[PDB]
Design a protein around this nucleic acid. Structure first.
Ligand SMILES: [Mg+2]
Ligand SMILES: [Mg+2]
Lengths: 274, 100, 207, 49, 291
RNA sequence: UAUACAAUUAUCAUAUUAAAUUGUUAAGUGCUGAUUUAACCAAUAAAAAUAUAAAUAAUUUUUAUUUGUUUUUAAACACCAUUAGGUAUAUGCAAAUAUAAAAUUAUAGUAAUUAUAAAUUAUAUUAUAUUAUAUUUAUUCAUAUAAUUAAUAGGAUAAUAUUUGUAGUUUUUGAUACCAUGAUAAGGAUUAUAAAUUGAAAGUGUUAAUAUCAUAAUCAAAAUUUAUUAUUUAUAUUAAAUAUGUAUGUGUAGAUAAAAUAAGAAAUUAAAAAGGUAUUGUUGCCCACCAAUUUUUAUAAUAAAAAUAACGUGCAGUAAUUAAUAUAUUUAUAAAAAUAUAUUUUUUUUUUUU
């Protein structure tokens, strides 16, 4: 028992005062006022710019290999790749990061000539800072991974070459120094360099041995004369209740009739008595 | 705001301003001085009372054709930033790109 | 217009048998002229007569294009040419012409390259190669027994020690495999086996 | 606020006017509210003011 | 109704975009544009208008205003010339201009008559009260009901009832002083251009009402302005209270068809599109003979 | 999921200080027989008349008990019958709207709020009074046929063109034998004498957007079955485009047409109130039953309640076609209907000692 207009919403049917059901507009005395005013400043000042515009229209094509892109766009592509690469947690040691930084540095070296950006002094302060940060990061990663990958010396040498062609003397000298250091420090970590040196259990590991010793000494002592070596049972299991208070099912005491009644067959007439 | 002041296109704004300029130029200096219609005051382009009798839907179509009512025109979307022209061509909202 | 009724859904099956209404032979959405009375056919003819429509020459053929509409009173059997079913026929014809008409989201970057970019990629470990010392040295570092600085030193210093052999008794069914293993073990366990066949892999040390 | 309401002058003469409620205020301590109905938004605003 | 919304149900047309009514902008902002006005201005400008137009005709407004009632009356009067008719709109305008000041006359008559014992109007205190309230009513700063309440509740004298027990037996005072004060206030205040009009209205609206049932008794609701009011002809002190205008007119069987066949004055002239067969209001199909 | 009714007036079962109860009268032919009613009708048909003065307001009504079924002469009178009759009035059995309340529905679990209000909508002149209406005339009413619609091209009396005689097949598709948007007509009932007209806007075949076999078109000599049309009546009768052979029957049934304008016509007439539960607005909401799916309480061969746009039977309610509301009885395809009693969210009509 509930009336409900299917064609129209009930609220829309009910709100008689808000809407008008009649659809005929009659003249009568229903005058309407059309008032239009304007000012001289509306002719020039305060004109909005529409969102859609043919000037800011771009056809975006895609390609996978980096060589297709110009160096200017290739630098942004490399940085976009490094954005997702730098989230990898490897204790800031690796080879892929050094390769990516080397690719960015090679992009700078190419754009020096093909991209006609100019020289290091020609490049303003912010891009100088970006270049210095990139080369320093490449050097740090190459040094970190040098002891494992013996090609980090080549990475550092290419970075030094790129600094040379970018004409940064202060960074080039440091790159020369670090390349000289690494070219002789790379072989130290290997085994043949240090034949003098050679190659501990945890607390849990030692306590496991202690427990095993106790179990064995109880086994040989009481395994035959009196089987009391069994540990205390945990057959009672906690079940979660209203406020997560663990309820424990205490086993029934022997001095009750419940277990005596339970052990008997349910139907004496039909169930076997043996 | 959008109810009291309906949005209108830049072409309509320019047309309104040019109509005001034309009315001001057509007016004479003596009558302008008498009426105190200096360039500061906004000029009233027109004002009239109309009366329309007929079916509601056809009256709506007629008014839309005559430009008497709007409320359904799809005006172009405005720029996300400062929509007013003449702003700096390159201006990032976040400065960023800082060193040290 | 909508084939589904406005009531709550009900169980399709009884204890073991299918409900006759939802059974294929007795489908509730199919007009069966054999099992329906005369008054439903009379209503169908009256509906096709009051509105300008062709009369039903054949009911068995008409049932193929008959359309069911759930109503509070019950099923409403209507023709595919009927104005009431015109909208549903429009949608069904469009579906039969081309099904793919719902926009599909653009897939992202390839998951393999996403894995290469994954933050936890360096924590992966692989099974050691028995004949490769570098693999077991790297896995020593991965398990945390040695230093990553000492990976190469351990790879050079790793010694190889022989291990007891592992031999798999394989063959056809009922070919004495379990009996041979029992005689090797000096035990008799084939007889107690359930069904007289081996059903689980068993590894046992023998001298 | 703004709203829409029906106005009935004659049994066969129905129109839809709009209802405007507003107020005018000045922190010097003077304020006053108003509400009106009129055929158009501008007329409703002026009558409410 | 034939619109897009109605036609979508009447007869579904797959061509939804269709201009039912051609675009024709009657307004002035839409028609013009800067490119049009740049060319238009050189040919049509203020200087060019001054050069090619002949001269056919606050303080300056008051200097040029003259007498508003006379300027309104002369239009209706001159409507009797050979090239124009006696327009009823002109008489309506003249009536409005003449009766624009009737509200103050109504209020002054109410204060003079309805108040049973206003006291001594000659006294400067009561005179100032009446003058201030009349000025407020004329300016519109105070409504008539509240002004009348102020007049009847204003402070006059301590022990007013006890003092009136000496003079008035029934509490009704002579109206000569009240009428004199109500004339004097309007004489002093520049209400109307003609000084005698105020006195004549005050006297006439009283002498005309004096011969009606309950001449000085007024219901509180209808005595002044209110949400529910009376007809202008049925108001208490109205200038059009007494009339015997024709209210019954005989009608023939063809009247609803020949409503416009007489000597009607058309606000909108009938056209062939609307009226299929109608010669006009000036024709006579059965003319007489004149010398 | 936790988180501030009211107490100055709330319509369904919360009655508690109140004077009641009982009178002993009326009416009594058979006569020559048509009473009542929209209609049918039944059997002697006339009748029951008496009041006030008087019972404290309270501190334990916590307390007895109590609210129109109450049994017989007539008049009234519900099931049922159909030719048409039967059938209810306090003596007992019976707490009960005159309200100390917490959004609808529902057993206090089922759905997601439920009700209600205002404005408007075609039924009711009143009797001097914005008009006397009332007379004359007329009525056998019929016509339709033989198919091709898609370019410009100049001449005598002019200073000169053979352009005398100007020569490029074939890719589109609707006003046609349906349908293929709009738009003019006919239809007199209240603005009148006066220097004046007695024909309306609410729409009539052809006309401007929906397509998808369409050659339907007069240039004569032609084929009543179809509503919407004034024909000549008894002395003289067929000559030019070919032009009506049928029906004499007491100015004659029913039914029906026209006129109060350069014509001739004259006292009883227009002029009140009074409604939406509908908003998709009567072609409307809504009602149970029928029919179809399904949920909840339940396991007892249970019962109850709830949701749902199209069916079937109806028309119960909505001033709604014999008014509606409440309780009791009764009938049953279903809304409901009829009675007994009590009410009007039923729209209303003037008697201050004749
Ligand atoms: Mg085996
Ligand atoms: Mg009914």
């Amino acid at each position: 028992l509930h009336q409900y207009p299917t064609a129209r919403h009930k609220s829309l049917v009910k709100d008689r005062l808000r809407f008008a059901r009649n659809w005929w507009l009659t003249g009568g005395n229903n005058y309407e006022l059309v008032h239009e005013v304007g000012h001289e400043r509306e002719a020039t000042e305060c004109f909005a710019e529409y969102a859609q515009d043919s000037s800011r229209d771009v056809y975006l094509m895609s390609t996978n290999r980096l060589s297709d892109l110009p160096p200017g766009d290739r630098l942004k592509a490399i940085v976009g790749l490094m954005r997702s690469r730098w989230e990898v947690k490897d204790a800031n040691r690796g080879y892929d990061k050094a390769k990516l930084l080397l690719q960015a540095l090679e992009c700078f070296s190419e754009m020096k000539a093909s991209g006609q950006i100019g020289d290091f002094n020609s490049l303003p302060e912010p891009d100088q800072d970006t270049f210095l940060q990139y080369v320093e990061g490449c050097s740090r990663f190459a040094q970190a991974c040098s002891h494992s990958h013996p090609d980090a010396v080549r990475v550092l040498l290419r970075a030094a070459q790129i600094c040379e062609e970018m004409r940064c003397v202060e960074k080039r000298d440091e790159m020369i120094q670090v390349t000289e250091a690494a070219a002789n420090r790379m072989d130290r970590a290997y085994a043949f360099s240090r034949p003098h040196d050679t190659l501990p259990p945890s607390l849990h590991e030692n306590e496991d041995c202690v427990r095993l010793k106790n179990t064995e000494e109880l086994r040989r002592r009481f395994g035959n004369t009196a089987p009391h070596v069994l540990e205390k049972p945990k057959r009672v299991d906690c079940l979660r209740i209203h406020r997560n208070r663990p309820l424990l099912l205490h086993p029934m005491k022997d001095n009750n009739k419940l277990l005596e009644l339970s052990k008997l067959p349910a139907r004496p007439e039909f169930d076997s008595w043996t | 705001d959008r109810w009291t002041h309906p949005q209108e296109s830049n072409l309509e704004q320019a047309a309104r301003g040019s109509a005001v300029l034309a009315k001001r130029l057509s007016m004479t200096v003596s009558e302008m001085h008498d009426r105190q219609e200096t360039a500061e005051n906004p000029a009233t382009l027109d004002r009239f009372y109309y009366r329309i009798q007929g079916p509601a839907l056809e009256a709506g179509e007629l008014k839309e054709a005559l430009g008497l009512k709007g409320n359904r025109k799809r005006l172009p979307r405005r720029a996300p930033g400062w929509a007013t022209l003449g702003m700096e061509k390159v201006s990032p909202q976040e400065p960023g790109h800082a060193a040290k | 217009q909508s084939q589904s009724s406005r009531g709550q859904p009900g169980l399709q099956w009884q204890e073991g048998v299918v409900d006759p209404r939802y059974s294929s032979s007795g489908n509730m959405r199919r007009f069966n002229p054999d099992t329906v009375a005369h008054y439903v056919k009379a209503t169908i003819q009256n509906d096709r007569r009051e509105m300008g429509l062709g009369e039903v020459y054949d009911w068995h053929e008409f049932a193929k294009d008959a359309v069911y509409i759930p109503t509070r009173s019950g099923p409403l059997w209507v023709g595919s040419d009927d104005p009431r079913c015109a909208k549903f026929m429009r949608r069904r014809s469009k579906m039969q012409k081309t099904p793919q008409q719902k926009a599909r989201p653009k897939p992202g970057p390839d998951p393999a390259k996403a894995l290469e970019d994954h933050p936890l990629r360096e924590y992966f470990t692989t099974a050691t190669n028995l004949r490769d010392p570098l693999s077991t040295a790297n896995n020593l570092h991965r398990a945390g027994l040695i230093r990553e600085y000492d990976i190469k030193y351990t790879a050079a210093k790793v010694r190889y020690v022989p291990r007891p052999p592992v031999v798999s008794i394989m063959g056809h069914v009922d070919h004495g495999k379990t009996t041979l293993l029992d005689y090797l073990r000096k035990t008799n366990v084939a007889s107690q086996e359930a069904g007289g066949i081996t059903q689980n892999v068993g590894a046992f040390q023998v001298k | 606020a703004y709203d829409m309401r029906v106005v009935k002058f004659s049994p066969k003469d129905h129109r839809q006017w709009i209802y405007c409620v507003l107020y005018v205020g000045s922190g010097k301590g003077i304020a006053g509210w108003g509400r009106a109905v009129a055929p158009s938004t501008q007329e409703a605003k002026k009558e409410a003011i | 109704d034939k619109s897009v919304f109605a036609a979508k149900r009447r007869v579904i047309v797959p061509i939804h975009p269709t201009p039912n009514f051609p675009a024709h902008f009657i307004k002035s902002a839409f028609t013009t544009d800067p490119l049009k006005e740049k060319q238009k201005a050189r040919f049509s400008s203020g200087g060019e208008a001054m050069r090619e137009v002949q001269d056919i005709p606050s303080r300056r407004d008051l200097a040029s205003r003259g007498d508003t009632e006379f300027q309104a009356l002369v239009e209706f009067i001159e409507g009797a010339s050979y090239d124009q008719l006696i327009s009823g709109r002109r008489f309506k305008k003249v009536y409005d201009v003449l009766s624009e000041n009737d509200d103050m006359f109504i209020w002054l008559c109410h204060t003079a008559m309805s108040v049973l014992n206003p006291g001594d109007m000659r006294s400067r205190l009561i005179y100032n009260h009446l003058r201030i309230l009349a000025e407020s009513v004329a300016s519109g700063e105070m409504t008539q009901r509240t002004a009348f309440r102020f007049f009847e509740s204003a402070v006059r004298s301590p022990a007013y009832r006890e003092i009136a027990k000496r003079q008035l037996e029934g509490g009704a005072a002579t109206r000569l002083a009240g009428i004199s004060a109500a004339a004097d206030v309007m004489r002093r205040m520049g209400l109307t251009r003609r000084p005698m009009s105020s006195y004549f209205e005050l006297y006439q609206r009283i002498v005309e009402r004096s011969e009606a049932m309950t001449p000085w008794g007024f219901p509180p609701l209808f005595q002044f302005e209110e949400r529910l009011s009376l007809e202008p002809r049925l108001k208490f002190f109205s200038r059009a209270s007494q009339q015997s205008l024709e209210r019954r007119r005989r009608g023939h069987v063809m009247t609803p068809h020949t409503t416009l066949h007489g000597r009607r004055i058309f606000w909108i002239p009938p056209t062939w599109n609307r009226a299929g067969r109608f010669l006009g209001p000036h024709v006579t199909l059965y003319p007489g003979m004149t010398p």
